[PDB]
């Protein structure tokens, strides 16, 4: 009913997570008006179809839905969090920044999915070039 539906309260976020048995649930937490969220939403919308077989994306405004603000601490910048089979999946980069390439976002989501489905609660995406 919208490429990237908005989850309007804690119950909806919980249901979005509990509702997927085989795909990573990608959730953007931030302020809808924030410049970082605009850039993040643009990328996510542009790759939503591409990752559909293994990931589903949702948007959450943290002013409206403050419930999970202890998970990133209302980090502030726009952040994306990942869940697979009801487990929060951690990523070590060696996701709260707008990336130019939408392919980079496809990469991280695919990396989280492929690692999480084999049992990992921690996945790594070496973004420490230099």
Long-range CB contacts for residues 76-79, cutoff 8 Å, separation at least 24: 76/30, 77/30, 77/34, 77/36, 78/28, 78/29, 78/30, 78/31, 78/34, 78/36, 78/37, 78/39, 78/40, 79/28, 79/29, 79/30
Three-state DSSP class for 16?
A: helix
Q: Are strands 87-92 and 122-124 parallel, antiparallel or unpaired?
A: parallel
Q: What's the total number of domains in the chain?
A: 1
Task: Compute the distance between CA of residue 82 and CA of residue 88 in angstroms, rounded to an integer.
Answer: 6
Task: Compute the distance between CA of residue 19 and CA of residue 35 in angstroms, rounded to an integer.
Answer: 30
Task: Compute the distance between CA of residue 86 and CA of residue 96 in angstroms, rounded to an integer.
Answer: 22
> CATH no. for residue 4?
3.40.30.10
8 A C-beta contact, residue 3 and residue 48: yes
Segments of 1-130 assigned E as strands: 24-30, 55-61, 79-84, 87-92, 122-124
With tokens 């490429």, the residue in question is 3
Task: DSSP letter for 63, please.
Answer: T
Q: Resolution (in Å) of the shown entry? A: 1.4
How was this structure determined? It was done by X-ray
Structure tokens that stand for 24 in this block = 């990573």
8 A C-beta contact, residue 67 and residue 83: no
| Boundaries of domain holding 63 | 1-130
Burial of 45 (0-12, 13-18, 19+ CB in 10 A): middle
């Amino acid at each position: 009913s919208y490429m990237l539906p908005h989850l309007h309260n804690g119950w909806q976020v919980d249901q979005a997570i509990l509702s997927e048995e085989d795909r990573v649930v990608v959730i953007r937490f931030g302020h809808d008006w924030d410049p970082t969220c605009m850039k993040m939403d643009e990328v996510l919308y542009s790759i939503a179809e591409k990752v559909k077989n293994f990931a589903v994306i949702y948007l959450v405004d943290i002013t409206e839905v403050p419930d999970f603000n202890k998970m990133y601490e209302l980090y502030d910048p726009c952040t994306v969090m990942f869940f697979f089979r009801n487990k929060h999946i951690m990523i070590d980069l060696g996701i709260n920044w707008a990336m130019e390439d939408k392919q980079e976002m496809v990469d991280i989501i695919e990396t989280v999915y492929r690692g999480a489905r084999k049992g990992r609660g921690l996945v790594v995406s070496p973004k420490d070039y230099s």
